């Protein structure tokens, strides 16, 4: 039928969440139950642009959907979700999430995220696995994948205690891995009670928003995790070094969630044995800078080498690089065509080399407000005057 | 590769011989000659004169040169292989030439080497 | 409907075919062509020249474009269907063109979804 008029339809639609649209895509891997409505064959990476798609694709009461909402609430970003059918044991669950080649048909589990590009152009820049992450196995898989991807993998360590979290963080040191310990505690309206989330979803979501309204090269350190209320463990944070629980976790290279009712994130640092890659800002810059370069030098990867090929590329690089400098992304740079390598042999075999040494924006951290309560300006007032 | 079957990917071809690794190499080496033959049609008959050898070695240098002009190749060299051109072969119609040339190497594997340093740090930020 | 025969009501028309469900669709598709013919009157005779096909395909792009400007349609596409234009057909006067375009969908069935909540309650009344 086709009604001709203006249908006044009484229906509960609980408040537009609102969310600034972002760009940085998110590789989500969680669990769910393939029912009649949740139309999404378990190991098939689907694409999501809004909660409505998340619902139609995954049981409204699925862990997938929970993470999807945790992202959207912050920023309307493009997500690549993979519905790992709920397994039984922790071992089976972990294995089923990690996946692999297994079924000759396609790459299951997290490996399905490698189909993100070529399927929907949604090459995950931010890997996330809600809960399935306490397990050292899944985290190792996340790290390896994250490398084979150049994507910040956002872990959530053992929610319980801090000793476990620290002990867990010491197991890593892999550049890409960026951990968030305190499991967020958000008030689920559905059951009307404090739910318990794994935190990684909210971190990734806010990561996307930070890439947009601030820059991919700006840390998400001090940014406000939209939605949510408290955590599953009150996080202390004060000044003066001390055993401030935050200072502790942010000296084992872990990000926490501080201030009233899960106000904001806290920690630009990342799990890395190498001090040079201590800042996520450093890693993310070094990665996405190159994403912009390649998505722009696509023409340069074929074509009959001419006399001017080397120059076309070294200038094309100086264009994208310069633009990034203009909009803050970096601070100076230097591109040229490494001579001690460019040879007749390499050129006949197609290859050719260039250098792109540049500097990245150091995120201001640890402002040291030194203060002295003196009695210098005392006579200057009060006495007589 | 790339979104929704964006594009092809691979200049390489099934070949045990590394020299013919690039389709660019094979296709060039083939179609170059298609252009030569479709142009030297006149050269495949006709009473051999004193100037026959030269008519052909120059006709070749014309088509070959044109291809160089429009990028197709990078330099070339045509001449009439002497150690073969003989009275016997000529009486039997035959005759030989060399056409050694170089083909455009398709740029592949650009190696963007990059170092995130802290060199240009003082150059900005601090005071300035 | 509405008081004392206020107004009409129904863009729909008697049609087994769903594509022609709207009178807007039919009327557009008809009168668009009325405007075309009353304008391409010159095109229905005249010695076919080399530029005849182009004179018409451009004349069409003029009337068609004007209609787009004043809302009548939303984009369009005119060209001279090649797989038909032949020497035979031309000798016999005939010739073909395509005029695929889109018509303005009349807004119908606005679905005002409404929820009387108690969200903005504390925002007023209590204390403030």
């Amino acid at each position: 039928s086709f009604f001709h008029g203006v249908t006044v339809t009484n229906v509960d639609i609980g408040a537009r969440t609102i969310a600034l649209p972002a760009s940085s895509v998110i590789g989500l891997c969680d669990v769910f139950t393939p029912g009649a409505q949740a139309s999404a064959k378990p190991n098939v990476p689907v694409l999501l642009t809004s909660k409505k798609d998340a619902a139609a694709a995954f049981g409204i009461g699925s862990s997938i959907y929970l993470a999807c909402e945790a992202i959207y609430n912050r920023a309307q970003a493009v997500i690549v979700a993979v519905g790992v059918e709920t397994a039984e044991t922790p071992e089976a669950q972990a294995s089923a999430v990690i996946g692999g080649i297994s079924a000759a048909g396609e790459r299951t589990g997290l490996q399905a995220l490698l189909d993100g590009k070529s399927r929907f152009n949604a090459q995950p820049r931010l890997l996330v696995a809600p809960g399935h992450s306490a397990q050292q196995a899944v985290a190792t898989a996340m790290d390896g994948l994250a490398e084979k991807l150049r994507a910040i993998a956002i872990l959530d360590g053992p929610n319980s205690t801090d000793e476990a979290a620290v002990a867990y963080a010491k197991n890593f040191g892999s550049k890409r891995l960026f951990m968030v310990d305190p499991g967020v505690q958000v008030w689920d309206s559905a059951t009307n009670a404090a739910r318990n989330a794994p935190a990684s979803a909210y971190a990734a979501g806010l990561f996307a928003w930070t890439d947009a309204e601030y820059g991919f090269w700006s840390s998400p350190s001090n940014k406000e995790i939209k939605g949510v209320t408290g955590t599953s463990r009150p996080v202390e944070f004060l000044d003066g070094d001390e055993t401030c629980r935050a200072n502790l976790l942010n000296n084992a290279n872990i990000a926490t969630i501080i201030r009233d009712d899960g106000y904001r994130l806290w920690g630009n640092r990342t799990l890395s044995s190498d001090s040079k890659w201590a800042f996520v800002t450093r890693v993310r810059t070094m990665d996405l800078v190159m994403d912009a370069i390649l998505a722009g030098h696509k023409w340069a990867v074929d074509r009959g080498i001419t006399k001017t090929y080397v120059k076309d590329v070294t200038e094309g690089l100086r264009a994208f690089m310069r633009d990034l400098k203009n909009q803050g992304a970096v601070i100076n740079f230097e591109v040229y065509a490494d001579p001690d390598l460019n040879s007749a042999s390499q050129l006949a075999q197609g290859k050719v080399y260039w250098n792109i040494r540049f500097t990245d924006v150091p995120p201001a951290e640890n402002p040291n407000f030194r203060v002295e309560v003196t009695d210098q300006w005392l006579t200057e007032v009060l006495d007589v005057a | 590769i790339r979104d929704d079957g964006y594009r092809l990917w691979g200049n390489r071809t099934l070949s045990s011989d590394s020299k013919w690794a690039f389709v660019t190499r094979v296709r060039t080496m083939d179609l170059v000659m298609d252009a030569i033959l479709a142009g030297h049609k006149w050269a495949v008959d006709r009473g051999i004169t004193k100037t026959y050898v030269k008519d052909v070695t120059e006709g070749l240098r014309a088509f070959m040169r044109d291809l160089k002009n429009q990028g197709a190749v990078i330099n070339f060299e045509v001449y009439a292989d002497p150690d073969l051109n003989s009275a016997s072969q000529l009486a039997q119609g035959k005759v030989y030439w060399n056409i050694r040339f170089t083909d455009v190497p398709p740029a592949e594997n650009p190696n963007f080497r990059v170092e995130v340093t802290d060199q240009w740090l003082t150059e900005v930020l601090d005071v300035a | 409907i509405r008081d004392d025969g206020y107004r009409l009501w129904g863009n729909r028309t008697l049609s087994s075919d769903s594509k022609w469900a709207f009178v807007t669709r039919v009327r557009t598709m008809d009168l668009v062509m009325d405007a075309i013919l009353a304008g391409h009157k010159w095109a229905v005779d005249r010695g076919i020249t080399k530029t005849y096909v182009k004179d018409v395909t451009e004349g069409l792009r003029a009337f068609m474009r004007d209609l787009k400007n004043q809302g009548a349609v939303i984009n369009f596409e005119v060209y001279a269907d090649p797989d038909l234009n032949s020497a035979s057909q031309l000798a016999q006067g005939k010739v073909y063109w395509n005029i695929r375009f889109t018509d303005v969908p009349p807004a119908e069935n606005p679905n005002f979804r409404v929820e009387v909540t108690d969200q903005w309650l504390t925002e007023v009344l209590d204390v403030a």
Partner: protein
């Protein structure tokens, strides 16, 4: 690869002027620029501000009627016309360059009739619509009353069309 222009022909309304048209002139497609100098920088930079008034001009040196009979015609943009031009090229195969331009004839200038010199009328169509093709391939299509500045297919005003809500 020397190209250069060899021969030229000019249409008005299908009627070929294979004869009197010793000069054509396509509309000089220019942008408006406005040299933007501003805070944080010395040296301007220049901005796409839209195009300039495209005017094209031919100049038959015969009392041609078919051209004169479009001057000041109430219906601006009734004058159509197509400016074809064959570029030779040293390697034979000529490149057809053709520029249809629905516009308003605007003005007509018959110069000094001297009883011993090609009189040479002149014309200057204020071009409204204008599609320049090369080798049967759209290179330009500039339509002001619609906003359709489209370099070979891609429409550079597709982004401003939305923001204006057209």
């Amino acid at each position: 690869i020397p190209q250069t222009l060899t021969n030229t022909n000019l249409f008005i309304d299908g009627v070929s002027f294979a004869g009197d048209v010793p000069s054509l002139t396509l509309p000089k497609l220019a942008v408006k620029t406005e040299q933007y100098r501003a805070g944080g920088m010395d040296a301007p930079v220049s901005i796409d501000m839209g195009l300039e008034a495209m005017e094209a001009k031919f100049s038959t040196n015969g009392a041609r009627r078919e051209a004169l009979n479009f001057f000041g015609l109430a219906d601006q943009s009734a004058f159509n016309g197509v400016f074809r031009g064959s570029f030779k090229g040293q390697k034979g195969a000529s490149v057809p360059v053709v520029a249809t331009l629905r516009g308003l004839l605007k003005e007509v200038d018959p110069g000094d009739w001297k009883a011993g010199e090609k009189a040479e009328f002149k014309y200057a169509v204020a071009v409204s619509y204008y599609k320049l093709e090369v080798d049967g391939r759209e290179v330009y299509e500039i339509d002001p009353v619609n906003g359709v500045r489209a370099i070979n297919g891609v429409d550079q005003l597709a982004g401003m069309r939305n923001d204006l809500g057209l």
